Design a protein around this ligand. Sequence first.
Ligand SMILES: CCN(CC)c1cccc(NC(C)=O)c1
Ligand SMILES: CCN(CC)c1cccc(NC(C)=O)c1
Ligand SMILES: CCN(CC)c1cccc(NC(C)=O)c1
Ligand SMILES: CCN(CC)c1cccc(NC(C)=O)c1
Lengths: 306, 306
Amino acid sequence: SGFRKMAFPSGKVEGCMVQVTCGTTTLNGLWLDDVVYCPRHVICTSEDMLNPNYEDLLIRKSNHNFLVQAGNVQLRVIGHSMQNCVLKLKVDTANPKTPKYKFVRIQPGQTFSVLACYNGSPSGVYQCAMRPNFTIKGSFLNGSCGSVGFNIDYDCVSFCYMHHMELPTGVHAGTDLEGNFYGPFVDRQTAQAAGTDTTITVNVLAWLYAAVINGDRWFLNRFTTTLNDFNLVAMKYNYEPLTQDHVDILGPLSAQTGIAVLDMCASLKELLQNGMNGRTILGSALLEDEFTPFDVVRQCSGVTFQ
Amino acid sequence: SGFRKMAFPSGKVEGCMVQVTCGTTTLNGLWLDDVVYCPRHVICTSEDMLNPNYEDLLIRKSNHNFLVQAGNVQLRVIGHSMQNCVLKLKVDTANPKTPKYKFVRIQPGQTFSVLACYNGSPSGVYQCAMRPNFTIKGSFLNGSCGSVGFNIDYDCVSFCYMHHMELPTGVHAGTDLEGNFYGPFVDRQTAQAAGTDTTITVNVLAWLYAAVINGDRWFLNRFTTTLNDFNLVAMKYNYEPLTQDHVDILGPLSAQTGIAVLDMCASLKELLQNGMNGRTILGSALLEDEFTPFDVVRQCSGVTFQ
Ligand SMILES: CCN(CC)c1cccc(NC(C)=O)c1
Ligand SMILES: CCN(CC)c1cccc(NC(C)=O)c1
Ligand SMILES: CCN(CC)c1cccc(NC(C)=O)c1
Ligand SMILES: CCN(CC)c1cccc(NC(C)=O)c1
């Protein structure tokens, strides 16, 4: 027992990180098969970032201008192309440590692990969620662009995120591995504001189920509610509206705890209205929203879902 | 910027995890060079765990009774010995993925990463601290015994923890890799109670420095204090006493923030006396104590310490 924010083991992704240098800009790439993926802003000088025209900047770049280093080995670049906001560098050597993998574009509320990297070298791993405003709240310093986010199912790495930049408010924006930004952001050094960071209700519910399973039960109340009554409350507190799709994926936790989803919603409603009164749940004094229902069911062995 | 609870990349340790079966008990081992390390309770039946005599139980075990599996490959056991509460199984094959490594026994307050594993297969990674009562607050389900905790310095893995059991209160106990328990615990299925779980003051201070660096400054107050005045307050709130050794390792953060260590102590004292008044620090509504000063300096690039 116990319940922790837990990342995926990172070794499968570690073996894919490389350093990419163009001119005087160095960042991280992702080497899969014979392609290296990286943010296209590798081609920009810091001054170019103010108002880049990427197509124009790319005219002055050849294969031999992209330096790709995998530990000590230099990789030979034999082609390059731009796909949305990523560059794809064709190299002459397939990565021997390529894992089984897919590229997936996740929805807001979904969680994933980030392998923060500098100069192609992995430094740390942590779990993130895609916020409803399409930012993530990461930890990223100079040189971490091109660090990736992923999920693992058995032996298959699903890559869902590549880090591109930090907003003025200190939250993070990036792309899928086809180079499409999450949210409205662009790869330009011009101030860009995030929308409302609402709480991922379905995740808070999952985590409340996790707390019950671990014996944190003080917050369980005597009430139930309806989806509409609950949503009236959610909206007030900047919680995402709960739908029947959300209710459906909470089914295994309801069954384990014997606590009906709507009963748990009524407990959550009272927490929102009364606060926690200085108490904790799973060692937190706030309601945690970066565990999905699927995440919980992975750390609560006695939840039946498969 | 941003600040996250971040584990070490786990790939170096992933390549060392094996499954160890003895009779009908299966758990995890750590394969380094030609030795596999695992909890000695692998030899016990569930009934044996009530009151095991390990020396006596071991008389009835031979090399061929320990099944060691590395993925599909079965490893041949050519010797075994008990060292404190661990078994060392000599195998005929050195692990080809052995990293540079050391065994270290950590102090209370030190942090490390756990690679939670089942059947020799890594499932998740998270950061832990050794609590002042010599427990950890982990996430461990059936079959996770022999999962390890570690730190990485550049290319060298320092192993500091091996998981052995869960106390009745749902917290975790284990050994160093020489098989000595942290704290007073024993590998027997008899109820064992933990002492006071005090807060690691020096870590809370480090994390307050991390918050300042990231622009969370609301809690900075107008006061300073002394080590004795502060410690009078610490004791009341079940905080570890702060020493000049602690003050010394906070030196780089004081220098960066220009906030004297004692000034930060005075801010902490006011948080203890007044609470957080519904505010957050680094997205927490409580004072976080599982980041060391060394941990902070790794995610706050503009802290000068080397
Ligand atoms: C838009 C400008 N760019 C891209 C070069 C930018 C802005 C802020 C921060 C970072 N770097 C990280 C690691 O987020 C990168
Ligand atoms: C029904 C089983 N569970 C959670 C218990 C499940 C199954 C499919 C998808 C998701 N989705 C998320 C976001 O967790 C969750
Ligand atoms: C003392 C009995 N043992 C050892 C077999 C024990 C007790 C509780 C839990 C676990 N297992 C884990 C993963 O902690 C193991
Ligand atoms: C002085 C540099 N730092 C932290 C900034 C440092 C150096 C050596 C040891 C520890 N120790 C811990 C527990 O963090 C910390």
